[PDB]
Amino acid sequence: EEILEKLRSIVSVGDPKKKYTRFEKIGQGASGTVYTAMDVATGQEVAIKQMNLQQQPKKELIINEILVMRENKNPNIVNYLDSYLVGDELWVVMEYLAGGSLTDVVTETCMDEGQIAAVCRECLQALEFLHSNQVIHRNIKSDNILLGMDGSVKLTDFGFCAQITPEQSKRSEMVGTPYWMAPEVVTRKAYGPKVDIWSLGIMAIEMIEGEPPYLNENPLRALYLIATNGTPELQNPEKLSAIFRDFLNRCLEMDVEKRGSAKELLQHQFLKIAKPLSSLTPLIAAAKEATK
Ligand SMILES: COCCNc1nc2ccc(C#CC3(O)CCCCC3)cc2n1-c1ccnc(N)n1
């Protein structure tokens, strides 16, 4: 389709193996292989993600990533820098911070409520910004949270991103990762930005239990469980403070009406007991030691 030509008018022109040097593969997933690099001038280090378009197309969401992200900059988001197309590959240039994913922290260490509150505050800030600009991430999970060496928190991977409008402020595309999905998305009801709030809630369960509910099961079985069970239950709910349990239940409220939004969840008292972001850095050290 001309959808490839629409993409050819968005990207920049260049080698682009002339500016950016010092390539190192630091990742490889469904979003494509990710490299670290640096362009002459400099001294800015960058991350370059590479998709094989003529080997694993989609392909409407590909363009949607660039368009939505290039005009939505925020401190709590990995920021788009540029994009090129070479051969069959699409390259996306973005900021880089070193220091692992939240996933490595939540599956190899234990976070206290002060640390969970700091991570949640930063995430809510990114969501509150996205939602105020009619943007829904639709794939909130620890895998998509990045941790700076100074304890910074950045939302990443907007490949499943979606833009709403007052004329059609809801969606019905069954997108995201099964276990982190809101019920209204699982059961194909019309859904809004509050689905990000849900997945944030599931990600808190990660930070509490080390993994999202039903993870032992299979993706489809999980979707069924989410559909049936609705609001998931902690193995040991008593291990959480009263101010934390209230926070979770306002993130995981079945009633989309009664479920909190990012703007009002930033006002929750659970975020008041938040520790400074520097407390997250020993978790990063510990995460890297179990990773070895
Ligand atoms: C946790 O994985 C470590 C490997 N790094 C990595 N994989 C990525 C996949 C997709 C995107 C992505 C993406 C976007 O959707 C974000 C909005 C702008 C367009 C591209 C970014 C990835 N990164 C980064 C990026 C920057 N720093 C670090 N440490 N890792």
Side-chain angles (χ1 to χ4, degrees), residues 109-154:
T109 80
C110 188
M111 301 176 53
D112 57 46
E113 294 194 6
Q115 292 167 311
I116 296 176
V119 170
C120 290
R121 200 218 296 110
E122 301 296 295
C123 289
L124 276 171
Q125 288 167 0
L127 290 180
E128 191 262 300
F129 160 73
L130 291 173
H131 295 170
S132 64
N133 287 333
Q134 284 78 291
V135 170
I136 314 177
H137 186 281
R138 304 192 305 180
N139 207 22
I140 297 299
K141 53 181 185 173
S142 69
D143 314 66
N144 293 334
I145 300 305
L146 293 172
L147 298 180
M149 291 308 304
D150 66 323
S152 302
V153 179
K154 280 182 187 290

Side-chain angles (χ1 to χ4, degrees), residues 23-27 29-53 57-249:
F23 280 53
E24 287 186 16
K25 186 218 198 75
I26 70 168
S31 313
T33 49
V34 184
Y35 295 77
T36 182
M38 177 185 294
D39 61 324
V40 201
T42 245
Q44 186 189 234
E45 200 182 6
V46 302
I48 294 176
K49 183 183 59 179
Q50 302 176 354
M51 267 245 83
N52 249 276
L53 304 184
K58 2 239 289 186
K59 28 187 176 178
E60 302 178 341
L61 284 170
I62 287 306
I63 304 189
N64 185 262
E65 186 186 49
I66 312 287
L67 287 177
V68 179
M69 283 309 99
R70 72 170 174 180
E71 59 164 357
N72 291 283
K73 301 297 173 58
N74 190 276
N76 286 124
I77 300 175
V78 165
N79 287 337
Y80 172 89
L81 296 178
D82 205 346
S83 63
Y84 304 88
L85 203 163
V86 50
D88 279 336
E89 281 188 337
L90 176 66
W91 291 16
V92 181
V93 186
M94 74 201 86
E95 303 189 306
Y96 169 80
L97 58 70
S101 64
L102 182 56
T103 293
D104 292 337
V105 160
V106 304
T107 65
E108 296 292 350
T109 80
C110 188
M111 301 176 53
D112 57 46
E113 294 194 6
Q115 292 167 311
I116 296 176
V119 170
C120 290
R121 200 218 296 110
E122 301 296 295
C123 289
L124 276 171
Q125 288 167 0
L127 290 180
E128 191 262 300
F129 160 73
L130 291 173
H131 295 170
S132 64
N133 287 333
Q134 284 78 291
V135 170
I136 314 177
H137 186 281
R138 304 192 305 180
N139 207 22
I140 297 299
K141 53 181 185 173
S142 69
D143 314 66
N144 293 334
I145 300 305
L146 293 172
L147 298 180
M149 291 308 304
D150 66 323
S152 302
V153 179
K154 280 182 187 290
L155 184 44
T156 192
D157 207 346
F158 286 71
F160 280 2
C161 189
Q163 188 116 27
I164 59 177
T165 43
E167 47 178 350
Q168 27 188 342
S169 61
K170 303 296 178 180
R171 293 302 196 92
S172 74
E173 307 112 80
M174 213 178 182
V175 297
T177 310
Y179 314 90
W180 288 267
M181 292 200 214
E184 58 267 23
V185 184
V186 177
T187 58
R188 301 156 57 197
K189 313 184 203 295
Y191 63 84
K194 283 182 183 179
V195 306
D196 288 338
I197 293 309
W198 178 276
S199 310
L200 178 72
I202 297 304
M203 188 170 61
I205 289 172
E206 281 193 84
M207 290 185 275
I208 300 161
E209 305 194 351
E211 67 179 16
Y214 323 139
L215 183 67
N216 59 283
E217 311 288 349
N218 291 323
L220 226 185
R221 181 59 190 183
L223 288 169
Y224 171 82
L225 291 176
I226 293 174
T228 57
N229 302 346
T231 297
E233 315 200 53
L234 292 306
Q235 337 175 33
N236 299 118
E238 63 278 347
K239 280 173 160 63
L240 303 186
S241 68
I243 198 54
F244 192 13
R245 284 190 300 265
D246 183 83
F247 174 77
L248 273 179
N249 287 338

